Every structure is written in C-alpha cells, then in structure tokens.
Design an enzyme around this catalytic site. Structure first.
Site, PDB file in Angstrom:
ATOM      1  CG  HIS A  41      -0.492   0.494   2.555  1.00 25.03           C
ATOM      2  ND1 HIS A  41      -0.444  -0.805   3.345  1.00 25.03           N
ATOM      3  CD2 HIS A  41      -0.339   1.423   3.088  1.00 25.03           C
ATOM      4  CE1 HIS A  41       0.019  -0.298   4.490  1.00 25.03           C
ATOM      5  NE2 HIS A  41       0.261   1.137   4.356  1.00 25.03           N
ATOM      6  N   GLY A 143       2.542   6.391   9.335  1.00 22.73           N
ATOM      7  CA  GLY A 143       4.200   6.335   8.886  1.00 22.73           C
ATOM      8  C   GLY A 143       4.789   5.010   9.577  1.00 22.73           C
ATOM      9  CB  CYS A 145       2.528   0.943   7.166  1.00 20.01           C
ATOM     10  SG  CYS A 145       0.771   1.396   7.641  1.00 20.01           S
TER      11      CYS A 145
HETATM   12  C1  LIG Z   1      -3.259   6.149   6.495  1.00 21.83           C
HETATM   13  O1  LIG Z   1      -4.598   5.351   6.650  1.00 21.83           O
HETATM   14  C2  LIG Z   1      -4.817   4.113   6.007  1.00 21.83           C
HETATM   15  C3  LIG Z   1      -4.736   3.116   7.236  1.00 21.83           C
HETATM   16  N1  LIG Z   1      -3.513   2.684   7.654  1.00 21.83           N
HETATM   17  C4  LIG Z   1      -3.404   2.201   8.900  1.00 21.83           C
HETATM   18  O2  LIG Z   1      -4.140   1.906   9.765  1.00 21.83           O
HETATM   19  C5  LIG Z   1      -1.946   2.299   9.466  1.00 21.83           C
HETATM   20  C6  LIG Z   1      -1.489   3.225  10.580  1.00 21.83           C
HETATM   21  C7  LIG Z   1      -2.130   2.634  12.035  1.00 21.83           C
HETATM   22  O3  LIG Z   1      -1.670   1.214  12.365  1.00 21.83           O
HETATM   23  N2  LIG Z   1      -2.395   3.273  12.734  1.00 21.83           N
HETATM   24  C8  LIG Z   1      -2.688   4.514  12.089  1.00 21.83           C
HETATM   25  C9  LIG Z   1      -3.330   5.790  12.391  1.00 21.83           C
HETATM   26  C10 LIG Z   1      -3.233   6.753  11.708  1.00 21.83           C
HETATM   27  C11 LIG Z   1      -2.828   6.730  10.407  1.00 21.83           C
HETATM   28  F1  LIG Z   1      -2.971   7.688   9.698  1.00 21.83           F
HETATM   29  C12 LIG Z   1      -2.129   5.660  10.035  1.00 21.83           C
HETATM   30  C13 LIG Z   1      -2.164   4.406  11.004  1.00 21.83           C
HETATM   31  C14 LIG Z   1      -5.194   1.653   6.735  1.00 21.83           C
HETATM   32  C15 LIG Z   1      -6.475   1.231   6.530  1.00 21.83           C
HETATM   33  C16 LIG Z   1      -7.158   0.262   6.162  1.00 21.83           C
HETATM   34  C17 LIG Z   1      -5.886  -0.676   5.241  1.00 21.83           C
HETATM   35  C18 LIG Z   1      -4.709  -0.245   5.215  1.00 21.83           C
HETATM   36 BR1  LIG Z   1      -3.454  -1.420   4.170  1.00 21.83          BR
HETATM   37  C19 LIG Z   1      -4.216   0.943   5.922  1.00 21.83           C
END
Ligand SMILES: COC[C@H](NC(=O)C[C@@H]1C(=O)Nc2ccc(F)cc21)c1cccc(Br)c1
Ligand SMILES: COC[C@H](NC(=O)C[C@@H]1C(=O)Nc2ccc(F)cc21)c1cccc(Br)c1
EC number: 3.4.19.12
Lengths: 304, 304
Positions: A41, A143, A145
C-alpha cells in the site's frame, strides 16, 4: 528475580530499517541482503485505499518511483515485484548490517517484539502476542507501516510480522514477510471485523508459573481439576481450550516448581470464578496472556 | 492508536556491552570510548559481599586481573580506578561503536529503558521507572550486574542507571554512571530497606491523558477538584503530592485533550476512592505510573 514484559534487543533489526517513498506516501521498509520489503500500500494515495487494484496501481510505477533511503544514503532500485501484500524492491547494494535471518509464520498465541519505526527510524520496542484472532494490540501511528515483528535465537533474527493497518476498532493487522496477512484481513480501507478474541490459556498458566517462581504464591490453592473440567471453565470465560500439547509444553515449568499442570489449572479456575479480590500477580490486576512458556523459561534463566 | 510500555531501541547500547571477569566473578561492563565501566563488586568473592572493604580488595588487583571481552575479542586493560561504586577500566582501544552519549542522574519518577545483559550479551529490553523510593522493579538474575538503564534523544544516549543488586525484598538497586547509588543503598550483602514507595501521580495523570487520546474515556466524570483537595486524597492513597510544576508539565496533554488538569485529577480521585469496578484502562486493571508526560507525548506523536 522480577518479571517484565521484555522485548528482544532490537539492534540487529535497527540496522535493517529503511524509508520507502512512492509518490507522496512514505513508510518503512526492511532491507535484507539486496532486497527491501515493504507493504504494497506504499503505492496508494488516500483515495486508492478505499478499494485499491494493486496490480493496476503497480503498473503505473517504475524502479525510479520507489525512493529508498537508509539513514541519509539513497539506495538504487533495480527491480520491483509484488508478492501477496508486500513489495520486494531489489537494490544494487546488499545491506552490510544484514543479520543471520529467517522469515517465519508464527502461530496465534506466540509472542514477538515489534520495533516501531517512522520514516525508516526506530522509535521504540515492545513485546506483544499474536492474538488467537490474528490481530495484535500494538502502538502504531501514521508512518508506522512496514515496522516489523521478530524473535531472536542467539544470532538469528526470525522475522514474523510486518505492520500494515489499524482496524476501525483500534487493534492492528499485518502480514508475514511473504506478504500473507495473519487472519482474514485485506489491505483495504474498509470495515473489517476481527473475530472474537480469546485468552491464550497456556500463556496465562506459564505466567502463573512465573509468578510462583518469583514469589507471588497467594493464588495457589488446595484443589486440582481435569482437562475436561478446566475446559468447561475456559469455554465460559472465553479462554482457549487447553490441550495435552499445552500441558506438555508446560512440563519444564511444572518440573521446576513442583506444581502439577492440572493443579495450576485449578488455581486458574478459581481466579476465573472468584476474580483477584483486589490483589495483584506480578504487578498486574488481570491475568496476563502475552508470555509463552518459552518466554517464561528464557526470562527466568537469562537466555542471551 | 494503541499504548504500550515501550522501551527505546537498544542498538546503540548493545554495541557498548562487554563482559568483565575478575577472579571467579563475571558481570557486564559498559565500554564507552577507551573506558569500561562496571560495578566495583566484580572484585568480590561471595564471602566478601557480606562486608567488603573495596579499597583493600582493589589493592590486591592489577590491570591484568580484569578480563574484559567484547564479543569474542579481548581488550587490553591499561588502567583501573574506583569512582564511588563503579570501576573504570582504561583500555587501549576506543569502542568503535561508541554512540554520542551523556551520563545523567535521573530524578525519581522518571523513566528509562534497561538492557538486561548476561556475560556481556544482551538478553532483553524493558521500560521502567525510578521509583520515588529510588528502587526499580526490574527483571535481573545472577550475572545481570552492570546492565544499564538509558534514554535516547535522536542520536544521543543518556546513561542513567547501572544495575548492582537485588534487595532481599526482590526490588532492584543501582547507581548512576559515576557510581553513586540511587537511594540509601550500599553495595553490601546486608538487609537494606527501601522506604515506603508511593505512586507517581503526575505519571498516572499522563497515562489517563494517554487513555483519553486512545479512546478509553469511561473514567471521565462531571467533577473537578483543587490541588489541595486532590492532595488530601493522594496522601491517603500513598500517591506523591501533585505540585504546580506537575500541572505545568501536564499542560501539553491538557491542551491536546481539552481536559483541564484539575478535571483529570477529579477523575483520578474517583478512581482512587471507587476503584475500577472490574473495568480496564489501556488494557490495565490498575492505575499505571511508569509513563511520564514526556513518554505519553513521544509515543502518541511517534518521536524517533
Ligand atoms: C493511512 O490510513 C490508512 C490506514 N493505515 C493504517 O491504519 C496504518 C496506521 C496504524 O496502524 N494506525 C494509524 C493511525 C493513523 C494513520 F494515519 C495511519 C495508521 C489503512 C486502513 C486500512 C487498510 C490499510 Br493497508 C491501511
Ligand atoms: C550474587 O549475589 C550478590 C547479590 N547480587 C545481586 O543481587 C544481583 C543480582 C540481582 O539483581 N538478582 C540476583 C539474583 C541472584 C543472584 F545470584 C544475583 C542477582 C548482591 C547482594 C547485595 C549487594 C550486592 Br552489590 C550484590
């Protein structure tokens, strides 16, 4: 004496963390030999995440679109490929700090250390368990990931997890290093439910043995039970059923303490039925399940 | 989201750990530049520990009696000296992995990461607080002496603790890197009491703010209190009195959540008086005090 939620020393993994940028998205990658592994992603924009076609998105990307930086030095990308939910970016330089390593798929209930990273830089390390429902209760922000989970056996790092997402429920989901998600999760911004989570019974018993070793004995009683009687209680309290395989793994701790596994099960049964009555065990007011029997022996014997 | 007892990445400290042997005693040393720091009780036999005269014992020791090994390579000792409860062994080679570092004496209530070591080899890393009574609740076995506590600010490691002993009560005592014990402890195998320990109130409030940030809000009430009313409750529950300095440090978290510090104090007051009623906060059934306001902001903002 003393018992802590101890993580592995993270040094060997810190030397592998890199930053991967594609377009406007930046996340962490794991640089091992001449390959950088990261969540696929990284190629998505926030708009793509709702329903991404990774194959179509990846086709609009070339080697030069993947910006890989190790500290302050840029890596030259000479190949890219998608394996399940991870990208493998081939680079022209082998990581000089690559430790002896393996990629392993851990079982639910097993534990591992997570090195939380942002922009390819390590921020912290903590120990957690892969829940029976294949989620982890981590600490991850934007960030994070590409941050990885691992275990260390002397000089060998077994990578078992790569962080991909947080469910709307606040728990975390990710993959093994071949990009296969643990659980039914997909890398899409859609409502996804983690099933009912259960308590890892063999780990609670292991921690009860750790408590006895470290002086906390108030919960020991004059009772015993059977595997079937105990499992009737485990079912009612959403605990995983205990098997003879679990009793066998608890063998060393049973031998060290002189407390038969079924007698420890009867103490656990009474704690489930009566609660703690405002008391604590190893500094905790709840039954802890994120220590395996292996972790208890390792910590209680000082394995380096 | 998510909140974990996160330790600093231990890599920079792993590169400093060495094994120090003197006679039949082996413990850990910290190799920084051309100096190895270790507990002075490395020169004692189990018989000496009951009432050691370190000056007299050290006089029977020469440079060649201190065996310092970094991994599998031997270091040549060219000087030795005692500074309070630590020995400084001058070696002929500067540690090539010496990070940017400082020696700091932390305040009680402050937190740090411990890299538990055995035979100069890292076994695990965990986060803890220096208790108000200057003990730490660690996880240490035989051979763990010389393991260090530290904090990291970007590239600089501030070493704040060196492990020396476990009290008969099972809690741990040690020194700063100048060899000065935290607390009234002496490096002697004699009965030593740690005073009454108290709960680090500013840290509990910081963790309550972390809970609100991460979605756990059940404990928020419609009440407020004053510093004096709150401190009457803190005194009764063996909590450290809250000062305006503590309210000031909680400023950023109060601003982020919109919950005034005294309103968070009223929630804490009600939790102290009524308990948790079988509920949890951030996966804990007790009030957690080993996270500072700085730790909460750092973890909740992803500082690397
Ligand atoms: C960037 O949002 C997309 C989201 N990313 C996360 O949840 C990753 C990361 C996390 O663990 N908490 C968090 C909190 C705030 C954020 F901004 C990002 C995170 C995502 C949702 C569904 C499938 C996928 Br693959 C990715
Ligand atoms: C070697 O016993 C001496 C003892 N050492 C520890 O407590 C250090 C170490 C520990 O934290 N737990 C533990 C458990 C088992 C051990 F064998 C060793 C330890 C000592 C007592 C009084 C002052 C001084 Br200085 C040192």
């Amino acid at each position: 004496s003393g018992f802590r939620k101890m993580a592995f020393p993270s040094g060997k993994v810190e030397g592998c963390m890199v930053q991967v940028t594609c377009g406007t998205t930046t996340l962490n990658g794991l640089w091992l030999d001449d390959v950088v592994y990261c969540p696929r992603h990284v190629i998505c924009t926030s708009e793509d995440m709702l329903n991404p076609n990774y194959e179509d998105l990846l086709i609009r990307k070339s080697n030069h679109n993947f910006l890989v930086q190790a500290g302050n030095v840029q890596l030259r990308v000479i190949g890219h490929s998608m394996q399940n939910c991870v990208l493998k970016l081939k680079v022209d330089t082998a990581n000089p700090k690559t430790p002896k390593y393996k990629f392993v798929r851990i079982q639910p209930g097993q534990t591992f250390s997570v090195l939380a990273c942002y922009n390819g830089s390590p921020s912290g390390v903590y120990q957690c368990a892969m829940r029976p429902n294949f989620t982890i209760k981590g600490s991850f922000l934007n960030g994070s990931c590409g941050s990885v989970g691992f275990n260390i056996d002397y000089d060998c790092v077994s990578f078992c997890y790569m962080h991909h997402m947080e469910l709307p429920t606040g728990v975390h989901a990710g993959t093994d290093l071949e990009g296969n998600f643990y659980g039914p999760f997909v890398d899409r911004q859609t409502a996804q439910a983690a099933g009912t989570d259960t308590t890892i019974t063999v780990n609670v018993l292991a921690w009860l043995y750790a408590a006895v070793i470290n002086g906390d004995r108030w919960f020991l009683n004059r009772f015993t039970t059977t595997l079937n009687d105990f499992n009737l209680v485990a079912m009612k309290y959403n605990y995983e059923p205990l098997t003879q395989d679990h009793v066998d793994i608890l063998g060393p701790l049973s031998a060290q303490t002189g407390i038969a596994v079924l007698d420890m099960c009867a103490s656990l049964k009474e704690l489930l039925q009566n609660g703690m009555n405002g008391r604590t065990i190893l500094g905790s007011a709840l039954l802890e399940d994120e220590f395996t029997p292996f972790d208890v022996v390792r910590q209680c014997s000082g394995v380096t």
